[PDB]
Amino acid sequence: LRVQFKRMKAAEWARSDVILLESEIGFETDTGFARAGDGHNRFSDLGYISPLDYNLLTNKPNIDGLATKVETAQKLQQKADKETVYTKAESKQELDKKLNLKGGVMTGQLKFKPAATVAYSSSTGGAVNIDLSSTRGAGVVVYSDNDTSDGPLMSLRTGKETFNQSALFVDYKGTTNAVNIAMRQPTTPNFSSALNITSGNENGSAMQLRGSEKALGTLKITHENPSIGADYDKNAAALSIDIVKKTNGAGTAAQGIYINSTSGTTGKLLRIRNLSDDKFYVKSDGGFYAKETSQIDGNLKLKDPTANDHAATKAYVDKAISELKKLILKKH
Amino acid sequence: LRVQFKRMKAAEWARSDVILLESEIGFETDTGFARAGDGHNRFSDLGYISPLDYNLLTNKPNIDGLATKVETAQKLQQKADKETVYTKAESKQELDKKLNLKGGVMTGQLKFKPAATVAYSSSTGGAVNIDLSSTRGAGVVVYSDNDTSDGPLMSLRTGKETFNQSALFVDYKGTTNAVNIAMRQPTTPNFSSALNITSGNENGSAMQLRGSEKALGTLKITHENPSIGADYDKNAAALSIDIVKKTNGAGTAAQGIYINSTSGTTGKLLRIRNLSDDKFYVKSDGGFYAKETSQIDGNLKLKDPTANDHAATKAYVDKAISELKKLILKKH
Amino acid sequence: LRVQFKRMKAAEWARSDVILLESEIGFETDTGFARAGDGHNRFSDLGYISPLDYNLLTNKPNIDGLATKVETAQKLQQKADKETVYTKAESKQELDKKLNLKGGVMTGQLKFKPAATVAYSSSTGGAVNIDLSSTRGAGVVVYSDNDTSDGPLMSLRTGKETFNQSALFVDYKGTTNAVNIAMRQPTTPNFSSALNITSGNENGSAMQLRGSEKALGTLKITHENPSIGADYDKNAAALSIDIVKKTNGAGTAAQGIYINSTSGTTGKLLRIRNLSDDKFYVKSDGGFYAKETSQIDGNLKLKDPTANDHAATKAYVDKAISELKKLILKKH
């Protein structure tokens, strides 16, 4: 027996009315595939003589080891897109433009414009607040070795005439000078001062000074010859006063020096010395002393003399000449 | 020949003791599948007449093109979770609250509390250090056009009586004024000064001033009539001094003006002029000059005269009256 | 019929020259697989009697639901690597070292070194610019309750003799003092001042002061006894002047006090009072007044008397003695 089977092209089977017997093999000549009958279905409705089931295969791949599009997408969704995020380097880039609290160098203007909680009072107020209580450095060090400039090192301005606080307040406790101004010896000379003050306020002194020294001056001024030449500073003075009219004014009645004791002093009110030797003075009682010959381009009104060293008045000379003239008239 | 094969349900085969001959086909009526004998194994242990091997299939999918769960997880693990990272926008958000070194506007308090390396000495110390050596702007510009306030523009306080540095130090080289205070003409008048100083320190002058002017005053004061009215400032003065007791004190012996030359001057110690014409002065020798008639509500003690323009003493008048009285007594 | 088929090992078939008839089954004894002839091809070139096509399988897996290596890689490439990005925490870390514009505490030096656009002029210049126009706090509050230190609270230095701006400029409008210095009562005494100024500038006054007070002093000084003891301050003075030579200098000709009216004043040029009672004064015309007995350790040159209270000259006494001597010589 060399057995052959009912056979024809797949597509020919497809429209054959032939019913294969149960288990009778039919062969598709162009595919080489077989099918067996079930006694009823036409060929195209039988299945193949052998399994076509993925789950009956051998050497299946590891399908469950594989990532699903869904699962992957869920996981990718938790990750940050490059686009929406700064790189470490772009981060340093930006942070390096920012001032460390630990310190740094400004190259531009630091403006302050306080919104103001209360902005406090005392040693916890101020837009800039510096406490050096645990340290040995300066607070604010401003300097310039530039040749010329358009602005000062520090400027304090108040705009409104009602302004009811100081521009600069110094409350000092310590052992050296509260405020110290050195204007050291020019090479190229200035026609100006270490401290210069102008006030146009007619109801207050330009400068007020109170002290309570045991044995010193409230203000001590010293002039020092700038030269070794004995008489070079001959037009200088420790204190110079001028008394002037207003521009286009009619003149002035202001006094030069006014000295008073509102509570009364027993001290010399004006005392003038050279080489620490009294030369002239006004005693607390307004009497005066002078050490050398003096001159008045005028007369002197004074009281009649009683002591021998008293200056004689004209009245006194005249009466003594007149007494002598009478007494001597003993032509009788 | 229409061939049929030993056949029965799969499950019936499953417990059949029938051994198919080698290559003899047996058919599973309910699955339509065939198996061939090997001459020994029962049906359930033969395999199907045709291959069930994934690797013999055609039109396999691209299994190796597919991502494995493991591989994907490795790669996802290198990526940043959204949660642990700032967005660009949240990054700008935070950086915009930080001060650019290039400049910016503070709206709150900048406190300093130095930890202090040494905090230096000179022009590289200070919590705030400003160098304007290459520029034409001011250093610290503080101003206020507010109507009233609770605090000054600048405040310097030192708390401890041992404190051995200044509150403000000015070391000036230049061609204009080191320190300049303008208190310009009030519309609403203040009863106060451009500069006001009080000291309760009994062992030091409230203010000390040294200069070495060739032809100027160490301190120059000018009073200017505030009015065009010739005599409006009649109670004003360039310099006003008061000398007072302590509250509930017994009084005072302080002098008004004290002038000395510790090294001896040949200059006039006090010189008083009007319209630049000497009117009164005390010479270096304590002698005085006065230009007009003067008055003493008292006597004057002086030396006997020798020149004709010398004031006569009482001694001198008396002796001349007495000499005349003797001489004339030639009643003999 | 129990049918058996031409059969032999796969590998034996592989090199058999046997041509199976069309649809004649041949069996591979070691694999259990069948093939059917096509009437021409050798065994090894027939295919199996049943389909080996992935696309004809049942229970296929969801291959298209699976992620491809390519697709996954594309998506991973848009995500940020952990390595190239800061964590939220590392971000806070860095930002917390930066100064909030809203405020913060510096612990190190803030240097300024302006690059300078123009650095302005007026109330919009300065490396540090503070405007308190809408607020009630101080601007710059510098203080120290430390015991001793190496640096002052504030320091202003200018290096170049050409420097053509001030160290400190105060432009004040308001109702209290522009600048106020309090050096309150020491427990441990300093040998120093509230304000101390030295200038070595021979061409400008160390301090200049101008005011225009209606009824006050341009400078008002008050000395206050520091003790209740009437005469404790007996060596004190409101104003103390010294006039000194240069070290190794030949001496000095500087004046003590110089008073002038460049425009001419009708006021008393020097006026000295005690308990507000005139005691001594120099009138605008250089004449003087004194209230008590005075002394000159010398002579007084003055004009011949004309009134009775005028001091007599020697000339005048002498002429009256001489007139009496003549007149009385009527021995004829």
From TrEMBL, chains A, B, C:
L-ascorbate 2 binds at N177, N196, Q208. L-ascorbate 3 binds at N235, Q255, N260. One of its GO terms (biological process) is capsule polysaccharide biosynthetic process. It holds the Pfam family Hyaluronidase_1. InterPro entries: Hyaluronidase_bac, Mtd_N. L-ascorbate 1 binds at E161, K173. GO terms for molecular function: hyalurononglucosaminidase activity. It comes from the Bacteria. Residues 3-39 form the Major tropism determinant N-terminal domain. This is Hyaluronidase, phage associated. It comes from Streptococcus pyogenes serotype M1.
